[PDB]
Amino acid sequence: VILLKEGTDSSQGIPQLVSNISACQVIAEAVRTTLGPRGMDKLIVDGRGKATISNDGATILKLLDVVHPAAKTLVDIAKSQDAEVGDGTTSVTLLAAEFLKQVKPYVEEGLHPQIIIRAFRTATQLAVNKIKEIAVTVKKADKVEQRKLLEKCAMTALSSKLISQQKAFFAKMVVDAVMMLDDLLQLKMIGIKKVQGGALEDSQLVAGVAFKKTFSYAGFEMQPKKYHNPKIALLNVELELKAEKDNAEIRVHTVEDYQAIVDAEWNILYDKLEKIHHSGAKVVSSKLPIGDVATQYFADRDMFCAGRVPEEDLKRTMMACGGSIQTSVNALSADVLGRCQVFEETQIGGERYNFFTGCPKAKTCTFILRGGAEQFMEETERSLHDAIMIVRRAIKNDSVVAGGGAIEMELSKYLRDYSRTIPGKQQLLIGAYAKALEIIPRQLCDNAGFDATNILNKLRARHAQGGTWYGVDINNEDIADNFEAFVWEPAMVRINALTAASEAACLIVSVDETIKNPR
Amino acid sequence: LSVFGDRSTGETIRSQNVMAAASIANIVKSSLGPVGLDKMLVDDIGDVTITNDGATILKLLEVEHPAAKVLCELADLQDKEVGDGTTSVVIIAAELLKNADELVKQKIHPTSVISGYRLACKEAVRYINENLIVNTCLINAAKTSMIIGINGDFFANMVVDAVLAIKYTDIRGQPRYPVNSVNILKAHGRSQMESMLISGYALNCVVIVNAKIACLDFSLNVILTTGGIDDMCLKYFVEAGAMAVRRVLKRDLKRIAKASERICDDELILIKASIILRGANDFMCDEMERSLHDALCVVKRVLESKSVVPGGGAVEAALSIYLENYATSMGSREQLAIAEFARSLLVIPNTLAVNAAQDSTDLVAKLRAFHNEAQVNPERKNLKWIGLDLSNGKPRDNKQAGVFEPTIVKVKSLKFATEAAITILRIDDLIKL
Amino acid sequence: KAPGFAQMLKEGAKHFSGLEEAVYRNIQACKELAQTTRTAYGPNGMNKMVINHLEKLFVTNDAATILRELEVQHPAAKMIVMASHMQEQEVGDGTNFVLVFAGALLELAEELLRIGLSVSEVIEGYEIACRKAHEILPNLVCCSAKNLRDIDEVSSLLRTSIMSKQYGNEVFLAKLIAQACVSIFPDSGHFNVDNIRVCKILGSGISSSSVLHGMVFKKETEGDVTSVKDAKIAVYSCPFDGMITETKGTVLIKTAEELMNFSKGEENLMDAQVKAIADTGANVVVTGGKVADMALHYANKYNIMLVRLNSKWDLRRLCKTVGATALPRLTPPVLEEMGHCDSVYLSEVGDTQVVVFKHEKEDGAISTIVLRGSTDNLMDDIERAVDDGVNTFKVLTRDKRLVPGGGATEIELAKQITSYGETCPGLEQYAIKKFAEAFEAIPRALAENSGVKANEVISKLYAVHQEGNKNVGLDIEAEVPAVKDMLEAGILDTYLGKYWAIKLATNAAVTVLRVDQIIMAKP
Numbered sequence A: 001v002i003l004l005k006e007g008t009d010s011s012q013g014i015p016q017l018v019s020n021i022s023a024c025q026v027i028a029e030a031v032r033t034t035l036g037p038r039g040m041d042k043l044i045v046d047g048r049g050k051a052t053i054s055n056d057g058a059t060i061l062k063l064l065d066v067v068h069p070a071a072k073t074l075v076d077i078a079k080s081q082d083a084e085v086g087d088g089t090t091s092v093t094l095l096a097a098e099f100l101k102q103v104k105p106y107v108e109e110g111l112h113p114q115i116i117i118r119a120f121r122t123a124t125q126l127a128v129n130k131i132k133e134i135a136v137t138v139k140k141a142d143k144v145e146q147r148k149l150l151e152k153c154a155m156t157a158l159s160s161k162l163i164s165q166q167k168a169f170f171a172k173m174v175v176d177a178v179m180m181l182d183d184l185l186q187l188k189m190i191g192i193k194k195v196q197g198g199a200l201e202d203s204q205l206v207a208g209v210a211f212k213k214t215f216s217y218a219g220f221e222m223q224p225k226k227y228h229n230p231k232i233a234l235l236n237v238e239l240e241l242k243a244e245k246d247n248a249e250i251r252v253h254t255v256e257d258y259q260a261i262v263d264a265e266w267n268i269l270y271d272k273l274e275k276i277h278h279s280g281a282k283v284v285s286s287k288l289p290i291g292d293v294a295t296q297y298f299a300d301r302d303m304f305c306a307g308r309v310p311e312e313d314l315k316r317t318m319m320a321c322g323g324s325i326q327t328s329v330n331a332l333s334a335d336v337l338g339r340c341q342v343f344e345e346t347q348i349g350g351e352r353y354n355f356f357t358g359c360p361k362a363k364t365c366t367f368i369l370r371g372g373a374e375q376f377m378e379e380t381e382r383s384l385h386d387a388i389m390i391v392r393r394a395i396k397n398d399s400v401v402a403g404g405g406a407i408e409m410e411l412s413k414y415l416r417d418y419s420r421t422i423p424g425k426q427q428l429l430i431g432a433y434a435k436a437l438e439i440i441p442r443q444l445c446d447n448a449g450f451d452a453t454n455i456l457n458k459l460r461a462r463h464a465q466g467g468t469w470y471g472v473d474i475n476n477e478d479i480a481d482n483f484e485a486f487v488w489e490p491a492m493v494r495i496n497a498l499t500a501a502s503e504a505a506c507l508i509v510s511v512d513e514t515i516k517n518p519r
Numbered sequence B: 001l002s003v004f005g006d007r008s009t010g011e012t013i014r015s016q017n018v019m020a021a022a023s024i025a026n027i028v029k030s031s032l033g034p035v036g037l038d039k040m041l042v043d044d045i046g047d048v049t050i051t052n053d054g055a056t057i058l059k060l061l062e063v064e065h066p067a068a069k070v071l072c073e074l075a076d077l078q079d080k081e082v083g084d085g086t087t088s089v090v091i092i093a094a095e096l097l098k099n100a101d102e103l104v105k106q107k108i109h110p111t112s113v114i115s116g117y118r119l120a121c122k123e124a125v126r127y128i129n130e131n132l133i134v135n136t137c138l139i140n141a142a143k144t145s146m147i148i149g150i151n152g153d154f155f156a157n158m159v160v161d162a163v164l165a166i167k168y169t170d171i172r173g174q175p176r177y178p179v180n181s182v183n184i185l186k187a188h189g190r191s192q193m194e195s196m197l198i199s200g201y202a203l204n205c206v207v208i209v210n211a212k213i214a215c216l217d218f219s220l221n222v223i224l225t226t227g228g229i230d231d232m233c234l235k236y237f238v239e240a241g242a243m244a245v246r247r248v249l250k251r252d253l254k255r256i257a258k259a260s261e262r263i264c265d266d267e268l269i270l271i272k273a274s275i276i277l278r279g280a281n282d283f284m285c286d287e288m289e290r291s292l293h294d295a296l297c298v299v300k301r302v303l304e305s306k307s308v309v310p311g312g313g314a315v316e317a318a319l320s321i322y323l324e325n326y327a328t329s330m331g332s333r334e335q336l337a338i339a340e341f342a343r344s345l346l347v348i349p350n351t352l353a354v355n356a357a358q359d360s361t362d363l364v365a366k367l368r369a370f371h372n373e374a375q376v377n378p379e380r381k382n383l384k385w386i387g388l389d390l391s392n393g394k395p396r397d398n399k400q401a402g403v404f405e406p407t408i409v410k411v412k413s414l415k416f417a418t419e420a421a422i423t424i425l426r427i428d429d430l431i432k433l
Numbered sequence C: 001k002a003p004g005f006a007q008m009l010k011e012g013a014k015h016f017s018g019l020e021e022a023v024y025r026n027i028q029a030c031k032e033l034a035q036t037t038r039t040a041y042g043p044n045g046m047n048k049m050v051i052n053h054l055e056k057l058f059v060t061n062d063a064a065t066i067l068r069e070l071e072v073q074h075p076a077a078k079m080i081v082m083a084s085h086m087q088e089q090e091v092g093d094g095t096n097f098v099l100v101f102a103g104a105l106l107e108l109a110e111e112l113l114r115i116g117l118s119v120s121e122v123i124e125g126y127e128i129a130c131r132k133a134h135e136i137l138p139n140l141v142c143c144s145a146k147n148l149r150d151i152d153e154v155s156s157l158l159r160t161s162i163m164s165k166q167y168g169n170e171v172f173l174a175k176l177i178a179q180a181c182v183s184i185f186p187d188s189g190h191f192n193v194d195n196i197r198v199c200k201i202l203g204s205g206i207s208s209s210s211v212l213h214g215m216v217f218k219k220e221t222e223g224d225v226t227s228v229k230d231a232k233i234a235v236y237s238c239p240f241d242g243m244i245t246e247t248k249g250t251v252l253i254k255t256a257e258e259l260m261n262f263s264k265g266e267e268n269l270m271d272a273q274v275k276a277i278a279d280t281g282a283n284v285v286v287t288g289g290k291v292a293d294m295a296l297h298y299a300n301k302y303n304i305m306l307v308r309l310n311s312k313w314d315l316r317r318l319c320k321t322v323g324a325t326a327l328p329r330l331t332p333p334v335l336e337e338m339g340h341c342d343s344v345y346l347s348e349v350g351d352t353q354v355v356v357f358k359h360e361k362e363d364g365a366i367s368t369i370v371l372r373g374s375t376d377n378l379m380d381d382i383e384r385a386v387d388d389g390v391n392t393f394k395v396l397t398r399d400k401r402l403v404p405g406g407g408a409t410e411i412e413l414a415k416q417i418t419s420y421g422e423t424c425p426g427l428e429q430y431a432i433k434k435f436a437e438a439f440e441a442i443p444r445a446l447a448e449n450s451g452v453k454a455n456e457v458i459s460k461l462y463a464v465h466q467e468g469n470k471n472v473g474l475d476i477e478a479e480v481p482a483v484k485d486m487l488e489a490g491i492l493d494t495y496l497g498k499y500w501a502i503k504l505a506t507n508a509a510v511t512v513l514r515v516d517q518i519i520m521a522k523p
């Protein structure tokens, strides 16, 4: 009758930790197959009914929104990994659950959770010291130009893909697109656009900002496209004749007043048209559509105008032209007007495309894709994005380590050999920590269809002989030196992954009870 | 399908034979070692048999399962061939099947697992033969095994002289150490220090420097008659002066034939080994009788089986490190098989540590650390050939402590355990009629 | 219909019969409360996955935070919780002591009631042993604070309080909390934990934190004024915007002409209302809501330092510190409701502009520890460890007496109480001897949470304590079950912490034992 809980759910002890360990594996299973470039995809549907298909561990975890709190901790650790690195969310979540899986039977055998944390904190620090030891700085290897090595990195990431034959052409432009930016590199600054039809060689490398230019209204044979120093207007105003937004419905009882009302409704479009010309905007780029009449206005005034621009391309032009977005047109002045050296309409692929070039704030560019279908350009959009990240990270940090699970097997060797010389309960735990590192190369083999048993066993033998960089080759079903293959990753990224992985496992292992306030 | 019986296959049948073999090991897991706990055996009648011997349990245990019966037949082969190690064989085999069943769940075929166990057992025997110790502290040997321990060197010095006096070839220059040669007795004379060694046979009978020792069995100076002597015939021996005795035991005459004082209430006819234990009370000296015969046999098994090896899990801890390093040299799907063979051997020091009421995860880790340092470099700062102290609960150099076993036990126990795991793991189907 | 229910006669309240042992049910509820908090004891305490009433996930190891979110309903358990709330007064530590020790007394009392001892004989024995404990505890005082107000002295003592609430940061927090506490001890008989207001900012980590004087606030100054010593301060929780009266004030906008006029009317209203602030001479204002863009021009027009503090509790500190109250209307020019401050200015620390309210002319005792952290959860847990550290020295403003830690006192105090229990004849020896074993539950929890065998630790402590080797406690180590001297290691507790905890834990258990039947009642 007088009950202590009264509907309050709560449990503690070994059953609580084992319960949280199984929930952590459920989150890894949702992103276990997405590991690698050739990883399997995941389909997610929301209440709207639209499906999202992608193998991005960061985007997948944001969409699941699991209610279990141990899972919320892993998902939150991925967000800190994005701000810290921007990638490695699948490795952190997949590797953190592997530490929990290996210490699961020892927890059941009565080993205290606190003793497990001392091993993770110890083995992690020993691993970080080994990463900085094995990590090599590569700036002028054999006096080779950095553009040459950076192309070998992007070619290997794009090898065995839809652009496999023309990977060299895509390799040059990817490096050139990254070289076009300033010192403060950024992935969001570069855009990638798609153009249906045509061969892969016809893919253009735009220097400035561009957009699809869905504008298909009247006003042809006029509007001289070329400009040497135009003033680019950034607006979201609709200049349609009968606009859904702007109208004038004035009911009167006089014929003479209707002539002014029909003209006054026309004056709203004309006054807005004149305010654009009043400030001297040579290029009018609007978010909303524009009517046929407004096209004839600027066509007569020696000015260009084309609406139906997405919001992203405008804001990407905001950082490029050096102006600002102005929804209105009355206060349009030089403080929001842009500048560029060459603005010209190009007919790449038959469709009209507008682009700027040589702007003062030209901190962006655009990559046009040419292929036989849309999915070839959608896969190539992200496939080249991976190569852009590889080229970016090599410029930022020159200290790197062999990818493809090569470092995970050396740390598995060092920590396993170090655990042997550690008397106490830390021996089996540091050894379990070592064996947990082998899940990264094991899934790269499973996700690639290869036999993980034969490769991981052959790979462990090569590491015992002295191979400090051998790992998994996604293309050929064999062991290959990822360091010689220019498959590199930064040393700090691998450090922050183990730190975030160990911190996540320790936080879950340090938990004993889950309390729930009924409210 | 229409058949007069049943049929079944898959992972469950290998697991059923694994879960069956694991049950037999757990029945004799806690009874491993000298401090093994006793176990009851309730027959269908209702009676109860209590003992701690793992070999005795398996012979009397009855479990209706084919896989379990293989381990019962396995223990009989190891018993008749050697007569020791049947408990460790059943436990080691069950652990190999446990780890093997886990590999089969990882898409590791049994033929790859079997090929690894055949390699791990082979190299393990080579590593064992490389780190043996041959017949060569005999005061410290029986000391560790031995209330008699209050005076270590006093009682133990008599044991090394007893076991050495019995040294005799008896076959083609074999020399062994016979068992029924020492005659341990007791007394209560004035102290526990008056116990004395005797270099001769102590005959418990009652009625001279005559070399003639007459040995006769038929019924009627040192004349022995097993069939008894009539009353009148004793008078004729007094005429010549013979020390003739009647009603001589059969077992005594065999020792007297092979061989050739004022004692409390039974004066012994000494021929001029044996040790008469003069004590204080029956409680103290009676325990000293069996305490001498026990540690005397431990020294006997060392000097008989000329090749021995350190016990206490020293072998299993060393093989766990060597086989783990040898695995990386082979590859070809044999790493996980040989690597899991290494972990399976750790059950012996893990089981003995639990039976000794100690943290097995600590002792097994401390035991592997010393053996690992032995493989890194041959320097003397690195500890070598370390075992387990079951009394104190800590590592101990069994080379000095005198804890050894015959080499054939540790060698054949791995061969029998590997052959049984292979026999059970090769099964992949069940057919009933 | 007969047979009736045994003893159930009062509002259907379950009256457990004599065979059912109604006293045992209350002991089980208090016993279960300890097991939740027994694992949160010491530096190796296991954190709790707490879910707030707002479906918010917080991870912590504080005992008081658990009981707040854990809605305790059994009134027998509420007595120990009310003792913990009383433990928060007169001292800022020992909450798990009251929970773990009281549960140990109730756990061992059930063993006595099963033998057949009366409930009153157990109560009288515990009250007697509590008196002996208060007589034995001063003799255990080994060292005391040197009373020098040195950061080295203060940081050495705070290590034990900060530890067991935030491990790893024992070194930094001991120095950061010390710098804020030593600045007020010169105010003899006026030190208050309330004066040290903790403010937390999202940042790199705890190492990036610092200590500052006055009431620091992370939100920078919205105005363009740097420093002003104007005591006239006024807080207005209403957001700065177009003024509207409490009357009708119906604004009818029809044409674009009237739109710009009344849009300019808002400019005249804010200019007229902000003008009233300067007319009173109040060049310092704090906003609770947003700020209009035109008001920023008027703030710089009359040279009024405008500040934006969006948190309500940030304003309550000012209402209780300087006295400026938060009125509901748009800038009521009421000088009576204004505050007083000797110096106010903006400051940039850690690449972050923060407002400062300090007292240059007046004596002043206000301070603030600007915490930095990447995760608000872990950063909020560091705040609770600061309060346990500041309150530790708020007790040392009283008689400065320390005792050993790590369970050293609990075995030395149990050893001495067991002696008096052996000499004292009668039935009181059972409850007195069990009162000593109730102290063993503390290092048993301290050893269990460290992953160490409990009985192996208690045997070593009683052995060395029998040799007179006092000051010997538990060595915090995952693999080593050995012990070491806590004094030389620098682990020391407070005398009043154990005094008030032993007193309230005994009374909390006695109040439960005195109860034998819980009855419901309708008003």
Ligand SMILES: Nc1ncnc2c1ncn2[C@@H]1O[C@H](COP(=O)(O)OP(=O)(O)O)[C@@H](O)[C@H]1O
Pocket: A034, A035, A036, A037, A057, A087, A088, A089, A090, A091, A092, A156, A157, A403, A404, A405, A440, A444, A472, A473, A474, A487
């Ligand atoms: N070309 C490649 N060859 C072999 N391994 C690769 C290659 N590219 C990436 N990997 C491996 O795939 C793993 C995941 O990479 P990535 O997808 O960038 O991170 P995440 O999977 O966390 O999003 C890395 O650990 C890396 O070793």
Ligand SMILES: Nc1ncnc2c1ncn2[C@@H]1O[C@H](COP(=O)(O)OP(=O)(O)O)[C@@H](O)[C@H]1O
Pocket: B032, B033, B034, B054, B055, B084, B085, B086, B087, B088, B089, B311, B312, B313, B348, B352, B388, B390, B403
């Ligand atoms: N004195 C001792 N010290 C340490 N270990 C011992 C000692 N005597 C026996 N053992 C251990 O007990 C185990 C079982 O011995 P034994 O009973 O002869 O074989 P089984 O148990 O198979 O019948 C052996 O593996 C050995 O390591």
Ligand SMILES: Nc1ncnc2c1ncn2[C@@H]1O[C@H](COP(=O)(O)OP(=O)(O)O)[C@@H](O)[C@H]1O
Pocket: C040, C041, C042, C043, C063, C093, C094, C095, C096, C097, C098, C160, C161, C163, C164, C165, C404, C405, C406, C407, C446, C474, C476, C491, C493
């Ligand atoms: N680092 C440490 N080493 C040994 N003992 C400690 C350590 N930290 C705390 N303790 C012990 O833990 C006990 C509880 O400390 P604390 O958590 O501050 O109070 P409570 O547990 O009541 O909240 C203290 O009595 C102290 O002796």
